[PDB]
Symmetry: C5
Subunit: 311 residues, 5 copies
């Protein structure tokens, strides 16, 4: 079966549409997500047109084998070709209404610099390669683009599922390719992070600042170093599985700054002790007293700067 | 093969029934479970009807290819079509009785706020898309809905497997959809959590409260901080298998409260030491003495409040 | 293809046999195991009868497609239908002799209360659903039930592979099911646990008892608390691979009892210190001296009781 | 269908080309990567040649079944044959132009001695085995070799995707084999490692060097040993998953040298204490004072030597 | 298609040969490895014999369907039947030369007592079941057994890939089974373990021995216990990937011994302190002085004994 011939040197327009049934498994590290949806395709093949009176039927149903179907493919899928045809209907004029159910593991990059207060725009790209007898272009039938009300993506808030209606028509290996961009907009549910990660992490850091109200070097070393181990362990406890970025993330800056704070705390503790030993308790006292305000103020300030830089 | 034509403008009623053979693999983080089951389908197609006296047979058996079968689909499955036809029987009147064995990874959301004392209602949804020639509705044959007595789901207690007999009726892309809700009611076996997690975690926290019977700052710092590290490692030991919720869980609250208790214990230990150093041992003694009753009483009280709020 | 007709109202006996080629992947958590085996089936289909004088051949060989084969299914598998037909031989009488190679992830529950000194009985259940024209019953050909001498299951000792010869013939969804039970008896190789887990865990607990020979509160706090951390880390090191049971396990009890011992050790250390501080070193000495015999004796006794309760 | 016969004892030249659509999942431990790409093949089959005036068509399209296609295989793939034919076009002279979409998990070794500042050359090898009737050789059509501009490999910078134009002809099991080498050149995005791993690891080591400004053995033991634990935990936190190499890696040497520094630090702390106890504080002071310059200088120097040796 | 008939009561000899293309994924815990190879089969079928002159061809090519092919199977594969036929060629006398590309996940047990200085013999077993008309036996064509020069297995050294030429012919379920043993000899690349595991682990133990140069019980308790935690974490850091053996391994013994050393060190530290407290510093000094030589000597000696017992 060859493609439908043109009426007069025109390309075949294939009207597309993705309707989301289920969304699941957003893998941050892999930068992938899985989807269960309908794919609707509509085009005109005049060769299939008929008189409804003669046939005694208002619409004819076909098997995929029986008629010519455009080779529509997904660009960014990790999944194998997972598709089941639901219906093929030919209206009296020769308009074919194709419908299939599919599931795919889609590969779309994520921006982690605002993590865990980040939002994403996931993409599902559709392509079709132009054939020797006719060029093919994609179109969006907005009536056949949407998502079911049940559609959820664990740990995320689903904002929208739209399509950039104008395709990207370009040349590849001497043939025309027509590409559409379906966008799934989502925003991370950040609630969990504040009682489960930010607050316990801030408590461990604050414990280290009690060393500014002690003159016991043995107690201070234990304080600052034990909270440092506790901090590490706490992030081991998180089992952070955020991929490696060629850029700095909001979380990454904060964590780094916290290591620096743990370091400076050690220096203060060391200086205070050295001065007490060097029979200069006057300076040792001044530094310790200053650090009681310096450490919380600098931390709060640095965080304001960081928050500002990231958002 | 087209659907059976109506006697007089009536929809095709497809009688369904899911009989659970095996249930397994409840993934909390994925919010999925796997199932091994029978799917029974029955509808009337008068074109298949026969006079048994002529046939010399009371029931005729068919191959799926040979006759029209309604395209029943599962809404919420992650799984690829995994179905094997067991039997297709046509009664003399035209009633087709279809039976298949299937297995599926079902995606059903879970409520974690009462975790690990939570109960779930898992769903298996069946759909049928109405066709161009005839509209289709799903029905439940209660005699063909059940579970085998062996059916177990590790770490859970299986309460029931029932079906909401009335289907959903709605339009999708200009066609009528008939959905059925099969509900598998389960309740978490919480026993394990009390000796393996709750009690050892309460012991580590109690050890920290011995600092209210000591005046040794070095010993107290060691106590409170080491038990805090211990706590973290103990939860790292858990290797928590719980998804990130946009809400607070019972477990989540408890853990948070325990971090707060570790923090306040440090403050007391710090204050008691500072006052002893400031030559005010009368206040330092009063605080330490109060804390001996305050810490356990507030903890017990706060837990009563939480338990009340969650259950 | 319909089943063979009865001579006079008798059911079709399908003689079965599983011969294990390979066993592997016993997943404790999942309660599953994988198997590579032969499945032998035999029944009579007189429609296939032939005269070898005419046929020239003493036994005919067929393709699964060519003849009626009973729909034998595995009840408790996770796996998809993974089967390769090796031979289908028919003798002049019509007796079919079917052989296939299969692999399957079998789901059979495990009893963990005697872990890691536990023994298991794994099951492989065959079923055949009776058809409209003839009832089908399963049978065991003992000559075709066994395991190869190489057959191993890592971390377990394979005792036996036998079959309950009497099938569980019952009624389901108005038809007759004939169920056979195959039993793979195994016992856990517990050697590894004693030098790798039991002994280093007993050493860490013993180190904590050295606090009964010290009067230094700072040293005692360090001892008892650091060994508690060590213990946690050591079970984190084990990365325990056991499921959550609705019952108490031998290992589970031991671990719990060890946590309780760590707690009571802290109480003693606390009491001894408070008394010394309260200028009552006479009682503090008595307690510490008693604890030197109390803790080992109570531990040994409690373990005898537990061992007795579990075995 | 047999291969096209030679005009006069010449081998069949199959013009190849791989066009990368998507690259993903570079697994360092497995030394594998996944690819989604076009495979273009072209050969002249003179039996397929046609007169365009008689046919009334300038190019004929075929089904893979209809014509002889060379058996091109990938050498180094872990993946199963995942290929979908897009187009088969025969020009009037009989020159077939084949195009397929494939995805494969490619096994190519990696050099870890410069990790995490390493660059790789990934290989995709195409083979063809000469047949009994005609010998086959591979060629590169440079116009059909490339990658889309979107092509990304998470955590890596994609430099180039080129092919060694000259194939490697050799004999195997008495037949001629034509191999082509496609090279995907990538360099690791090392940014992440400096704030997330190198710097916090250097801070933990610096904290241990404060023991050179203290005379308190109890405080020093705490410092040096706790930071040693922190270092371990920090690398557990990294969950380094870099395979086991028969050679020393840059990272591996650094880590090793850090363990040695932690050991020497303990010796210094031990020596300093022993001398103070032996009433030789003059030597103890000299050593501690020396160590303040010795440790940082030796470390900086050793790192320059290492960097030089590795780069 | 029946098997070729015998000339005079002789079995059919099928000449086999495995040629390794790729080897990868040696899973120690699963005791499996993956392979990509060629399988060459050759047998004589006189029904396929021809006069070269009549057909005008020296060799005829076939489709697997067209001719009788022996059902050769792999015994110890976890993998599903992953095979692609490359070529089938019939020589004028009727000798069929079959060639296929396969990939399999092979299950072969491993000996871990000399780990990580262990060597393995991995097996690939080929079986053939004798048919009703003719008995089939396996043979090795040594010219068709080998491995490509590129063949590597990460973390191992590939010594040889040979085949025990005499098959194991035996009776199974009343038919004759002919089995061939293909052997892949490998030896572990142990370099990595000495700087990454053995040496940092020995350093942590040596740090604990500094307690024999200190009289400070608080410092010694910290030393011995902290290094014991460090040791655990260091093996948790290693996250050892070795299954559970019913026998003791070299690594296993070493680790155990190290735990015993950590325990004895605590005893010494406890004894030394008790004696100092009991105002017997003469004995306390003697023990500490002895331990300075006892611990290294006993350790070195015990290791010599162990090494000797294992190798
Ligand atoms: C106690 C700590 C509480 C922290 C959470 C408060 C922010 C909540 C919020 O509303 O955060 C939202 C913005 C993201 O802005 P957006 O991307 O434009 O979305 C805006 C749309 N909203 C408002 C509907 C969501 O994130 C931030 O400002 C990040 C602040 C993080 C501070 C933590 C620093 C502490 C040290 C570690
Ligand atoms: C020692 C600690 C023992 C704790 C377990 C006792 C509850 C057992 C029970 O019966 O728990 C059941 C209820 C759930 O109520 P439900 O969902 O309506 O089911 C009710 C039907 N039952 C009774 C048949 C199951 O959970 C709770 O009340 C949770 C109490 C948790 C207290 C732990 C707080 C300690 C700090 C951390
Ligand atoms: C030093 C510690 C050594 C412990 C192992 C000794 C038992 C060996 C044995 O023979 O254990 C077998 C029995 C299981 O009895 P069964 O199921 O009937 O099989 C019996 C058939 N046998 C004998 C051929 C295997 O397990 C036990 O008694 C468990 C004892 C565990 C004690 C550990 C407590 C220490 C605190 C933590
Ligand atoms: C503060 C620490 C900062 C360290 C990173 C600085 C190097 C950046 C760079 O440019 O690194 C690049 C070179 C790799 O050289 P190349 O393979 O030839 O590629 C060169 C092409 N460039 C320059 C475009 C990338 O790596 C190094 O020299 C490694 C230095 C690591 C030092 C860390 C030691 C500290 C102890 C642990
Ligand atoms: C500093 C520590 C260095 C340890 C490594 C030295 C052995 C190298 C070698 O050559 O080891 C080889 C033999 C294995 O003998 P094989 O199986 O017969 O192969 C022999 C063929 N070779 C020589 C070509 C490989 O392993 C051993 O003797 C193990 C010794 C381990 C000692 C570690 C004990 C320290 C406490 C923990
Ligand atoms: Cl696609
Ligand atoms: Cl479905
Ligand atoms: Cl089955
Ligand atoms: Cl391939
Ligand atoms: Cl096989
Ligand atoms: Na399509
Ligand atoms: Na169906
Ligand atoms: Na301490
Ligand atoms: Na069957
Ligand atoms: Na510690
Ligand atoms: Na090909
Ligand atoms: Na075969």
């Amino acid at each position: 079966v060859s493609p439908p011939p043109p009426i007069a040197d025109e390309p075949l327009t294939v009207n597309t549409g993705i309707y989301l049934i289920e969304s699941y498994s957003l893998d941050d590290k892999a930068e992938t997500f899985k989807v269960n949806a309908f794919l609707s395709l509509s085009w005109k093949d005049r060769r299939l047109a008929f008189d409804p009176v003669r046939s005694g039927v208002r619409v004819k149903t076909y098997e995929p084998e029986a008629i010519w179907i455009p080779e529509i493919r997904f660009v960014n899928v990790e999944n194998a070709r997972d598709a089941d045809v639901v219906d093929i209907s030919v209206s009296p004029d020769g308009t074919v209404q194709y419908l299939e159910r599919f599931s795919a593991r889609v590969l779309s990059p994520l921006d982690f610099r605002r993590y865990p207060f980040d939002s994403q725009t996931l993409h599902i790209y559709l392509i079709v390669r132009s054939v020797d007898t006719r060029n093919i272009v994609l179109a969006v039938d907005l009536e056949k683009v949407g998502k079911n009300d049940d559609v959820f993506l664990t740990g995320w808030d689903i904002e929208s599922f739209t399509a950039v209606v104008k395709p990207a028509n370009f040349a590849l290996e001497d043939r025309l390719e027509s590409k559409l961009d379906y966008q799934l907009r989502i925003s991370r549910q950040y609630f969990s992070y504040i009682p489960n990660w930010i607050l316990p992490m801030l408590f461990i850091l604050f414990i280290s600042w009690t060393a500014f109200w002690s003159t016991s070097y043995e107690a201070n070393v234990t304080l600052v170093v034990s909270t440092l181990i506790a901090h590490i362990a706490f992030n081991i406890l998180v089992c952070t599985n955020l991929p490696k970025t060629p850029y700095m993330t909001y979380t990454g800056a904060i964590i780094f700054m916290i290591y620096l704070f743990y370091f400076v705390a050690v220096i203060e503790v060391t200086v205070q002790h050295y001065l007490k030993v060097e029979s200069q308790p006057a300076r040792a006292a001044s530094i310790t007293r200053a650090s009681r305000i310096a450490f919380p103020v600098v931390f709060l300030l640095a965080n304001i700067i960081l928050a500002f830089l990231f958002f």
